[PDB]
Amino acid sequence: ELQQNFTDNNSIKYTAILILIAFAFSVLARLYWVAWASEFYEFFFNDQLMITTNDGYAFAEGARDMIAGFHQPNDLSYFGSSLSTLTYWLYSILPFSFESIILYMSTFFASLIVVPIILIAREYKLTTYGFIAALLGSIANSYYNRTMSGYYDTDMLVLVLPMLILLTFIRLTINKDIFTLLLSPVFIMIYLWWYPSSYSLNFAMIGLFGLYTLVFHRKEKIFYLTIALMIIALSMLAWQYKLALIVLLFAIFAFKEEKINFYMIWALIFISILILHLSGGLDPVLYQLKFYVFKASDVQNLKDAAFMYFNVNETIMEVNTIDPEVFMQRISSSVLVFILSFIGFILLLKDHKSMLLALPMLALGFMALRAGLRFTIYAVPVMALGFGYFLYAFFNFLEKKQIKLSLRNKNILLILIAFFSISPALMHIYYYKSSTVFTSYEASILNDLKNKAQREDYVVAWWDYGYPIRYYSDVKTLIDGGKHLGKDNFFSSFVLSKEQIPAANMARLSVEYTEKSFKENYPDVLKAMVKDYQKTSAKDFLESLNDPNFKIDTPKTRDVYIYMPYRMLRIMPVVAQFANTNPDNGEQEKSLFFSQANPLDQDGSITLDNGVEISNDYRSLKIEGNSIPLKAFVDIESITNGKFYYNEIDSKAQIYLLYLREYKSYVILDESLYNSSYIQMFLLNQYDQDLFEQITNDTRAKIYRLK
Amino acid sequence: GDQNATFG
Numbered sequence: 001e002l003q004q005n006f007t008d009n010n011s012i013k014y015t016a017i018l019i020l021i022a023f024a025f026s027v028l029a030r031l032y033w034v035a036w037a038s039e040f041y042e043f044f045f046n047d048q049l050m051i052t053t054n055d056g057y058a059f060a061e062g063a064r065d066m067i068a069g070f071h072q073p074n075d076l077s078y079f080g081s082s083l084s085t086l087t088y089w090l091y092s093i094l095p096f097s098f099e100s101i102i103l104y105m106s107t108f109f110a111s112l113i114v115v116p117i118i119l120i121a122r123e124y125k126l127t128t129y130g131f132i133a134a135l136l137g138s139i140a141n142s143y144y145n146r147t148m149s150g151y152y153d154t155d156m157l158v159l160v161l162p163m164l165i166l167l168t169f170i171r172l173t174i175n176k177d178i179f180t181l182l183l184s185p186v187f188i189m190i191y192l193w194w195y196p197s198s199y200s201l202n203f204a205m206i207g208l209f210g211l212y213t214l215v216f217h218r219k220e221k222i223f224y225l226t227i228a229l230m231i232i233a234l235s236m237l238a239w240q241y242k243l244a245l246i247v248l249l250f251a252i253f254a255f256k257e258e259k260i261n262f263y264m265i266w267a268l269i270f271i272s273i274l275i276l277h278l279s280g281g282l283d284p285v286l287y288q289l290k291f292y293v294f295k296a297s298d299v300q301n302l303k304d305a306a307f308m309y310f311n312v313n314e315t316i317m318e319v320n321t322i323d324p325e326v327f328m329q330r331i332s333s334s335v336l337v338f339i340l341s342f343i344g345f346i347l348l349l350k351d352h353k354s355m356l357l358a359l360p361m362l363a364l365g366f367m368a369l370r371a372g373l374r375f376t377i378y379a380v381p382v383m384a385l386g387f388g389y390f391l392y393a394f395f396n397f398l399e400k401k402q403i404k405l406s407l408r409n410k411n412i413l414l415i416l417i418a419f420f421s422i423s424p425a426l427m428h429i430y431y432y433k434s435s436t437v438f439t440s441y442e443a444s445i446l447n448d449l450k451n452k453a454q455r456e457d458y459v460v461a462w463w464d465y466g467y468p469i470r471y472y473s474d475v476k477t478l479i480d481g482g483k484h485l486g487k488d489n490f491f492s493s494f495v496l497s498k499e500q501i502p503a504a505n506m507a508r509l510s511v512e513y514t515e516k517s518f519k520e521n522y523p524d525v526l527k528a529m530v531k532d533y534q535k536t537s538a539k540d541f542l543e544s545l546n547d548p549n550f551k552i553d554t555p556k557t558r559d560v561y562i563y564m565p566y567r568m569l570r571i572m573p574v575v576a577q578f579a580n581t582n583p584d585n586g587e588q589e590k591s592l593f594f595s596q597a598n599p600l601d602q603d604g605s606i607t608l609d610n611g612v613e614i615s616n617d618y619r620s621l622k623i624e625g626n627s628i629p630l631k632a633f634v635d636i637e638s639i640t641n642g643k644f645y646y647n648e649i650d651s652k653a654q655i656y657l658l659y660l661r662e663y664k665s666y667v668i669l670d671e672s673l674y675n676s677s678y679i680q681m682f683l684l685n686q687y688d689q690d691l692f693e694q695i696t697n698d699t700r701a702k703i704y705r706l707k
Numbered sequence: 708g709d710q711n712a713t714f715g
């Protein structure tokens with residue numbers, strides 16, 4: 001059984017068996033988390049585990065609304081979005097509950113990545129090494145991270161499609177396959193339909209395919225024709241125009257031998273580049289660079305049409321930077337396998353020139369080093385192929401140096417190598433005991449909100465929570481995962497971190513002006529607010545919001561709820577940072593002192609996660625070797641009852657220490673954050689009953705209503 | 708790590 005030769009085998013039957021085994025491996029591998037999570041009630045809702053990224057609830061809301069057949073005007077529902085649409089088709093065709101489909105789609109579709117990897121390896125007569133590469137590439141750390149069970153997001157096909165395009169380019173270079181003329185464009189369309197941001201990669205790949213053609217195939221018409229077709233597929237033409245051109249020119253080339261003259265096809269390239277140009281061409285690319293590579297604040301380019309806002313880029317986890325070791329493990333689950341993968345990729349390049357067309361994806365992945373961990377994904381399968389090639393190279397070496405190795409022993413060696421190098425990825429899965437976006441309890445609080453509020457009502461929350469809130473509660477939000485620039489975030493930041501009088505003025509005004517902006521398209525909503533109430537600057541207007549005698553000339557068109565969950569506590573200073581910024585200025589206003597930490601236990605002088613020693617006295621802290629006096633120790637025994645004990649310490653001091661008995665947690669904050677709407681209305685349950693009605697009072701979250 | 712959520 002093991003004595004036979006697998007390396008030389010590239011048959012369709014063997015390749016199908018390998019694809020099936022690798023695909024079952026990919027699925028099986030992301031089934032471990034489901035087995036783990038299933039024993040915890042905290043992760044369920046509606047008899048099924050819950051989704052596992054914040055962004056999944058956007059497409060989940062969209063799917064739900066497609067199934068119901070409508071949404072509200074200007075809830076920003078992803079109705080008609082690609083992933084919502086595929087979810088709706090599968091839901092109508094299959095017998096599983098909505099939550100199960102939405103849970104398992106990534107587990108199915110992300111595993112398709114196994115197909116192009118080993119078909120590409122097969123085009124080079126290396127199918128078995130392709131199998132190894134597909135094993136590594138399907139579960140490699142960062143790829144797994146964004147495609148595990150419950151990662152109900154657009155990432156699940158975001159490498160599958162470009163890899164299929166690559167395969168298509170390879171078949172054209174090796175067999176001059178005429179079906180590329182059809183599939184190359186079609187795939188680009190599918191890619192653009194599934195993930196519009198793909199524009200940039202497509203533009204790069206097509207672009208390189210052009211330069212490649214000017215070099216290695218400067219005379220083969222099929223390359224120029226497919227380039228023109230692909231440029232059309234990149235454009236904003238309606239789909240019927242695109243498909244008409246693609247199928248038309250395809251038949252004309254496939255069944256005509258007098259074919260298309262070269263002048264005509266250069267004309268087609270010119271018409272094409274003109275069309276893509278009208279379609280905005282290259283502008284989306286420079287915009288994406290502006291946000292990710294150059295990290296500019298004003299990315300929409302509105303100098304004095306907007307105010308100046310804190311930059312969200314340095315605030316998003318996905319976009320956070322990463323050190324070389326973590327970069328390498330993100331791509332290959334290990335430093336060693338990464339080095340060998342890179343060597344392998346070089347060797348593959350200087351043996352198969354066509355793999356040059358893989359350089360954009362590779363480049364995108366490396367761009368993570370400047371642009372954030374998010375991007376390593378794009379280098380995972382290319383590099384996996386590199387690793388495949390390294391192995392082929394190595395054993396090739398071992399024969400070109402006449403090393404006595406049986407077939408059985410070469411095969412045992414291969415199986416052992418693949419297992420040992422795939423180990424770090426499996427270990428990563430085992431340890432990546434990721435949890436749900438929210439807890440069942442929060443989903444229950446938000447679903448009861450659904451039965452209490454109206455579809456046309458708003459809840460002011462932080463943008464992190466916009467998609468789940470709209471999913472579980474079916475209401476409107478001010479900000480969410482895709483509406484979260486500084487200019488967007490400012491209002492929720494203000495509502496949550498200022499005092500209650502101006503926070504409630506801002507909740508009414510911000511919800512009303514957002515709703516108006518659907519009909520009026522303000523480039524800056526705050527700027528419409530300012531230049532409406534006859535104020536001179538942003539600061540002038542905002543300071544006038546502090547007035548208990550504030551006139552409100554905008555009539556009330558809906559209820560406005562405010563959502564205050566316990567889990568916001570640890571990101572409160574970051575939330576606060578947005579409204580801490582003078583819009584006239586861009587300038588920071590106050591310093592914001594905050595942190596939350598857990599005791600390690602107790603003897604005698606408590607230590608906490610963050611190295612902050614709490615005095616035995618409960619009268620001073622010791623941060624970084626410096627002892628700082630406390631103004632007060634607030635001992636909170638009931639977040640819902642608002643039962644707490646305010647111990648005065650030093651009227652001359654300025655920092656507060658809070659103990660959360662119901663969580664065994666400590667908070668260290670300043671006067672400005674202590675008086676914020678969140679800390680008062682959530683932690684201490686002190687709210688102006690003339691301004692808000694308490695709708696939900698729970699230790700894990702509070703919901704208030706304006707009036 | 709890979710969340711369109713807030714950190715800090």
Ligand SMILES: CC(=O)N[C@@H]1[C@@H](O)[C@H](O)[C@@H](CO)O[C@@H]1CP(=O)(O)OP(=O)(O)OC/C=C(/C)CC/C=C(/C)CC/C=C(/C)CCC=C(C)C
Pocket residue numbers: 055058059197198200201204285288289292293360363364367371481482
């Ligand atoms: C649920 C949700 O929020 N979706 C939104 C989506 O609807 C919205 O349109 C979008 C923008 O707001 O954001 C939500 C979804 P998203 O975050 O996944 O999209 P995104 O922010 O655009 O992600 C950007 C990622 C990309 C992969 C795009 C390209 C990034 C670049 C830095 C440009 C690279 C330039 C090239 C020439 C490519 C080759 C690389 C070289 C040469 C180095």
Ligand SMILES: [Mn+2]
Pocket residue numbers: 055153154711
């Ligand atoms: Mn996302």
Ligand SMILES: [Mn+2]
Pocket residue numbers: 071072075077455474475
């Ligand atoms: Mn709705």
Ligand code: NA
Pocket residue numbers: 040041042
């Ligand atoms: Na439990």
